[PDB]
Amino acid sequence: MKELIIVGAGGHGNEISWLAKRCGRVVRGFLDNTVEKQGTFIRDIPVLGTLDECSKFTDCDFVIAIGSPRARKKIIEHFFPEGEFTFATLIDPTATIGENIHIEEGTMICAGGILTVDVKLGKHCIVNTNAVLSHGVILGDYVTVAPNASISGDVSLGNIVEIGANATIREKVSVQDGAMVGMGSVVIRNILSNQVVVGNPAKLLKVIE
Amino acid sequence: MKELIIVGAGGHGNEISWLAKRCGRVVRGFLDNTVEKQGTFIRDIPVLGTLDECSKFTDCDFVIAIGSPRARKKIIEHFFPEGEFTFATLIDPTATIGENIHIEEGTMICAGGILTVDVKLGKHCIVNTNAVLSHGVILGDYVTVAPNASISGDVSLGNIVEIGANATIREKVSVQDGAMVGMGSVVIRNILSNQVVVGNPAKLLKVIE
Amino acid sequence: MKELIIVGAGGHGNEISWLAKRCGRVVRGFLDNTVEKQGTFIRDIPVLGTLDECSKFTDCDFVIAIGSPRARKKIIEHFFPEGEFTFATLIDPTATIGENIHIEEGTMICAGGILTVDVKLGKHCIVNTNAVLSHGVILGDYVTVAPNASISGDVSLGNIVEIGANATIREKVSVQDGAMVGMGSVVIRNILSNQVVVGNPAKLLKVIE
């Protein structure tokens, strides 16, 4: 396999370097814009430079190990023009990937995650630790599912959606592009574009855009 | 082992055909009453006919792969007279079954489920994806536990109880026959027969019968 | 390895004797102060006597298999003077222990638990069934994390903290010594010493001391 460059040397890049190692990948290093992180390491893996150095590593696969959906879209659209770069798909050895699971490139499926049957993910998705996607779930591009999220059958998550940790989504709910479900929310109604919903039962807090 | 007939070719029958395959079972097909599903398939497994065709497959094990507790009881009582048919017990290879676990026939224990010690399940139970039943939990017949439910020590769930996804039940709580706990509920008090409770903390919504 | 003495022959001692067996340990027996439990067994393992008999088993490792943080501290401080006894560290074979995980003695990591990277636990901690501790989480001494708890990145749990089942803690939250988070709580703010918080969103209920 190609060596891997991890974009983002924060909390998620920390866990994704761990994921990559468990997947048998060689991680060349991180790219990160943080001044203070230049010349630093996570567990023997160096921060190589800033994101505009990505063109020096076209031989590598990339992954954008940043939780914020909009951050991953912003980075892909600025630094990663269509067809110039390749992206890894990282699936933890302890994740369960069932039948007729379709996952597009750049996606991270973390330890203990379960995708049962007929689940479709777009590009640069995250399914974090111990989250569950039941039958017929569809994710767009740049979706973040946090640890322990409970995504019931036939839920649709649009592009740049974020589902917070240990939230629960009723079967057949649709969540439109750019929405955010707060950690622990219990969602029993469809969510409209860019809405932030929180609580039990989930209620509209604000729009994020 | 006997070949398997799955009653119900919906979302749960989809996941239970997956479970059966992972358990090394040969699935003969589904029975389903849906007109539009006659002559259809899930992943090479045909819908063979309607439920009244069950008498043509007495050579097979059956499982009732329908989430609603009352649906499974209704189907067993109409179509499956005592002692005429055999039922499979399906335990995902990634489920954890500990010590002194007693599971009666027709039960489905799904991927990532954990039953620790001294857990007793009656007939035709479901313990769905990544749910946990702690020490001394007792389930009656036709109990449905949804994905990620958190059933603490010494909880008692009566017959035809349903616990919604990622709900949490305090230790030593009793839930009487036919009750329903909504998804995400946090249950800290005993629940009476046929009560529907929802929320954090769970409150009585209505009676289901 | 040394044989093991389990202090506490209740629900948690039941599950920890199971854990010990799965870890390939020989359990000599339980110590328990309950009159009615003298001469009793859990799955072939006897209650040997009361806690003041611990000095007859200095050849053994001990574990304090009692959920209440304050109970474990009380027992260690009364019966287990510094340097007289050794404590087991029990990690279920199905727990995931990642990289740069530091766990001090007496700790129990239960089935399906996940500790990702840079997690630090003090002495006599519990991480129960299917709980998740994300990057940079720090636990003090005598912390109890209940089943399915969702402890996000960089959370700090002080000494004698208890996090209830399937609760969710926002990243970078600090919980000071002796606090309690109720089952199912959704914690988005720092918690002060000995505070009990419950609900979604978590609110102060009372002080425990």
Ligand SMILES: Cc1cn([C@H]2C[C@H](O)[C@@H](COP(=O)(O)OP(=O)(O)O[C@H]3O[C@H](C)[C@@H](N)[C@H](O)[C@H]3O)O2)c(=O)[nH]c1=O
């Ligand atoms: C948006 C953006 C970010 N970065 C860098 C800055 C930081 O070093 C890094 C982001 O690190 P961070 O720790 O602030 O955030 P993340 O690594 O995304 O972590 C977040 O999501 C995870 C899923 C959670 N587990 C964490 O608790 C949460 O803080 O990415 C860039 O280099 N360029 C960018 O354009």
Ligand SMILES: Cc1cn([C@H]2C[C@H](O)[C@@H](COP(=O)(O)OP(=O)(O)O[C@H]3O[C@H](C)[C@@H](N)[C@H](O)[C@H]3O)O2)c(=O)[nH]c1=O
């Ligand atoms: C009650 C009843 C049902 N059926 C058939 C009709 C349908 O094709 C099938 C039921 O399919 P369905 O998708 O409507 O429902 P289920 O397959 O039970 O799925 C439900 O529970 C699961 C645990 C959840 N994961 C799903 O999100 C939820 O929709 O069973 C029969 O053939 N006869 C019956 O008597």
Ligand SMILES: Cc1cn([C@H]2C[C@H](O)[C@@H](COP(=O)(O)OP(=O)(O)O[C@H]3O[C@H](C)[C@@H](N)[C@H](O)[C@H]3O)O2)c(=O)[nH]c1=O
């Ligand atoms: C405080 C104290 C207790 N004990 C004994 C008495 C009991 O037999 C035993 C405690 O048993 P118990 O069942 O009351 O409690 P625990 O074994 O701690 O169980 C509790 O925490 C677990 C994590 C949960 N899964 C259970 O649902 C919850 O009840 O310890 C002693 O022998 N000495 C002590 O000083």
Ligand code: NA
């Ligand atoms: Na799990």
Ligand code: NA
């Ligand atoms: Na949960």
